[PDB]
Amino acid sequence: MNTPKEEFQDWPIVRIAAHLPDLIVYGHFSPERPFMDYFDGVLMFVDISGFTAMTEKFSSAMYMDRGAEQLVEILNYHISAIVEKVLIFGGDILKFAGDALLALWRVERKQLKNIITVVIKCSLEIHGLFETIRVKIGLAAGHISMLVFGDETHSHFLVIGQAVDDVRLAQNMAQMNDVILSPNCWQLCDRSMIEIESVPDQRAVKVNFLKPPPNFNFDEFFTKCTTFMHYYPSGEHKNLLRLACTLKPDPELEMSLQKYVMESILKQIDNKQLQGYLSELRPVTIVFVNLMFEEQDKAEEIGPAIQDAYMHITSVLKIFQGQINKVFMFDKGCSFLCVFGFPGEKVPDELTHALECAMDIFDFCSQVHKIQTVSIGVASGIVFCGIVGHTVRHEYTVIGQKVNLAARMMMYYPGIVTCDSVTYNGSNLPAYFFKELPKKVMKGVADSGPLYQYWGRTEKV
Amino acid sequence: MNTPKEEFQDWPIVRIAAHLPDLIVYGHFSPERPFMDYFDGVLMFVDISGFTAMTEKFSSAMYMDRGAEQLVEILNYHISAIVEKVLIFGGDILKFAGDALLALWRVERKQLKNIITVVIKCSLEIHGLFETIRVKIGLAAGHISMLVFGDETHSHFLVIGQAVDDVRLAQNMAQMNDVILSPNCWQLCDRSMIEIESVPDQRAVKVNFLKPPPNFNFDEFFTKCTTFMHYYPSGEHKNLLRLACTLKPDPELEMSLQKYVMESILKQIDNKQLQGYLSELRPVTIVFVNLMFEEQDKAEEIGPAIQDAYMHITSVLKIFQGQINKVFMFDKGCSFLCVFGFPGEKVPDELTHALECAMDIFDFCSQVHKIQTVSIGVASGIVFCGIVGHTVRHEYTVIGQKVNLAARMMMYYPGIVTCDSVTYNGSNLPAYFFKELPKKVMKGVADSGPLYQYWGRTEKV
Amino acid sequence: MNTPKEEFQDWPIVRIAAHLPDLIVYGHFSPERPFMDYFDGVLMFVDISGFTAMTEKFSSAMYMDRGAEQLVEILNYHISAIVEKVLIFGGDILKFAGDALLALWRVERKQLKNIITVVIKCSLEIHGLFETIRVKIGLAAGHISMLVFGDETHSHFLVIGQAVDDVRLAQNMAQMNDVILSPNCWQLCDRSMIEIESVPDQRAVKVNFLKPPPNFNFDEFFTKCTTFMHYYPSGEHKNLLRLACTLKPDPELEMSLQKYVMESILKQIDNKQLQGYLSELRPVTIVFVNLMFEEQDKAEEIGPAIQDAYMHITSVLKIFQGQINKVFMFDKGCSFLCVFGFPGEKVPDELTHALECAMDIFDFCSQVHKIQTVSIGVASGIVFCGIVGHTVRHEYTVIGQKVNLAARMMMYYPGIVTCDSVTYNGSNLPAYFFKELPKKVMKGVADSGPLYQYWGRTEKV
């Protein structure tokens, strides 16, 4: 009796799970919104802005109308390598976003110390890929909250808390090729493994060297650390980068997981759209919404507020097929990256509509309990869209100078709706609906062009 | 000198052969129609109505517009496992159809006894997959006729005879998890292998246990039985589930095999249509044609009649791009499952046309020599369409309550053209073209709604 | 720590490299045009006209509208096998074209003798595939020039010189199953390896037998010959048919290589078009341009002329989306195979436009320095288009009686623009714009139909 080999199982549920972390795939939590949960872990934030800064290079005429295709190929080639390192070291890639990848090693409290060693080694081996288009790494550790929000058809998640705030602060201190540890990470780590130095005006530290004790053996140590890693591929599945590659059809699980993935990605997954259709340089309008809270580390306070904001945003976006591309925590606040124009969702008057939707969002969110400040940046132009990452772990992402610009406008012009010159000029709304703003030098931004506040239709706000 | 490994050979002829049994793939018979041939074998009929009854579940709004995709994924996951068992035990899957899969082990007469043992073991291991959405299994053995019918562009086949009648009768007696043997199967089997019980008012038996003799070794026995299995993958190809996976380009063979496969499937096979385009919940009209004969086990009588009917049906269907999805033998008669509306073949007025085509078919077939009764059921609504089965052995199939309803209408209202309320109401043909029928309780049917006879345009028929 | 296996790397750059020889893939030469380089090597020309003559068979109604699909499947099945032999013997397939495949083993001068032995063995093993739709093989050796020409967006290459002239002359002497050596090949070869015979009225020879010395071991000999083969897959990559399968993303390399590949192929490569869309029987107009030179073995003379001609041709073709499918050296001259109508590039009035473009090309090229004669053949009808060859090495190709006819018209009616009857009749240009020509018997052509000169719009040329 023959024994044929199992076939490569490429079911829709597997393909959906490539777009999600294990935190969600194996999360099994209530469908109630908001949902909050609490754990401990180590975070790694890998600043890949040096790669995504290539969007400019690839809009050159030199690329003969295949800039987007070339961009996605070269980005994925480098980002894949980072993803593989994270996964082989036992990490969960949470999100690709804010010109960064964020990864998590969730463990019980007692194991944070040893897991920090693992993550430092991983970090150093990531830097190792690119010796000779480099990255900066921040590490944090400690208490982490998770929030899941959404409605009956769509779900989003966020991780929150001081360790999350810390990991971005750490990464912002890093220079290229650095690994920076948060103060708490440094307090919790195995100091015998590493040589550090002080970072001026900061309690964060820089790892100069991982130099373990004489009798240390990393592979044996790692094996010990895998006892605490629930989903590390093992046994018959030790050849797989993710256990999620083994997922079998389960309609109730797939119904829950598809809520995290945009409809046009699901169309591709279902082989009802060409696999290359979403890689494009396309004109869009970015509406970047920032919500600041009194206290942004307290999920129990900020979770209902985000949920209420989300319900309104989604209703407003529905009317114009705008989409939410990403939600993430910034140093200050919860940010929604909304896009008007992307998977063939491109209505005419996208600009006047974008500004009107921004104002609606601004007015509603400003009256939500516990939301202290709302800030919205609106920028329009060519952006790269595509599925970025590894075959086994990837996400649809939008990258470009106008993305960056809308993000910086919402941070440098807080409490108002701002727009760029493309949007202002294109809108053909009357000019007294705007205010011309002072020029600010914004980290990452070369020549803003004139920026404007969208004051709105009436003098008396 | 290097020796690179043969590549995965995924030629069009291989892809076409996935849709056909070995009976046809390796049949090499004349292109003359009808064609009849005669052999012996063991049949297994696996009632998968418990899986296909899930079409209802998947039309819920809960499935957010991906019901068809979810349905095909979960069906294929379970049906694949059944198919693999059949193939590894040396069976030929003949058809997926009538909420069942039918499989054949063709052998010389002297080996029927030992092959029945093989098939009983297979049957028990199929039940084993689903312990903890179960199936019922009928087995028959004996003389089997095959009929191939069609024209210059299209071919269809049927297996016929008492063993075929028996295998459906056996399966209809089974409860869930049962294996029922036909009277002849029980007469021909190795009684020392099994413990049976009587089935009330029947000469069929139920297998309680396969309990072989003390010195029996199934793997050694199976190896002996493979001497008689012409196409069992072996040697260099012992890792393949089907020898047909090894087929090489051969234009004369491909011309013959493509005649069995619908044009829209061939479009997919030729990579000229997306691989997911045929998985859909779509509105159609089912026209289910049953032809009863004096004697339905005699291919030499019924073969010309079916051929003549087929020639007329196809001409009538051509005019409205209706398609024949399946042809199969029922307890009573040869049934044609015709569909109006499926691979983007959807003409307007599908309902008046469907009724007019049914009447045409009814009038012509009623005058065909040896056709004793014609019965036609017409039902319209949402049905699941898709390629169902294993990668290596699968078929386009239509599944749904309206399929079931049209099938039961043709059996419970013999000798007439009947239609459901959707069809009657939608047609906007005058009401005196119909007769409102008595309500019958039909096994498998919950609330028919009012049913109608299509009497036709004139009072005097 | 797990070690997952590298995935099958199917990047766009790899897929582009399948369409090109190693000569270009690893060429790294200046982007300046024309570019010329000089080397030595052995050439093999494999006449596959016996396969491509099947286009006629596959336009039969017997193939039910899948002639093109069946043709490409059967062609690729046989041509793949030839390609694998060439590659495993260390050859570089340069082009698929002129009903032939051309391959090159580039080596330093001192190794030509031993490499000829390798190529003769390869040739004999190619014939071996088809014992029991056969091929003819010519071999040449010696000095070879390469020319690369084009503009900022498109590139083409040619190999030139007496060895190239020789390899076609050798192949034209061959009968089926023959291997014919050019005079220089025979002068340079290891005469102890082979038994030859004279070819009447020729200094070329026919290989009767490869009968090496008593102590000869081909595998050991081949291993020695691989020292001189720069890109022979080896070591960790000894399982690959081409090193080019290992190419990694590199935007500057991909920008250079995509210039050799038509835009519609790049669309497929980018998964923005179905993989089967370019296999078709379609009506087109072939415009076959031949340019003859005083001295066609001297790249330094003919290279600027070809470049100047190319610049004009491309400008003329642009206006009507005509494409250049192939450029190659014929016994006499440089030929451009231009096509009007192929990857959905089909403008109305294709015929009057084709004739007007031919005349433009004829008038311009006739005034180019060093171009001695221009001849253009114009023929219109159904042709097979598709990607032909092996997965790892293949090219878009057009095949058909009208291709053949336009090629023979340009050779048998030199110095003029000629067209077939389909073109003349269809154009609805006045009849005095043409001259009806004497009938010539053209090798390969059965019934021309009447042929015409396109004299043009005025009496006085």
Ligand SMILES: O=S([O-])[O-]
């Ligand atoms: O989920 S992280 O963007 O706050």
Ligand SMILES: O=S([O-])[O-]
């Ligand atoms: O071929 S079986 O449906 O009678």
Ligand SMILES: O=S([O-])[O-]
């Ligand atoms: O490149 S060969 O056609 O002269």
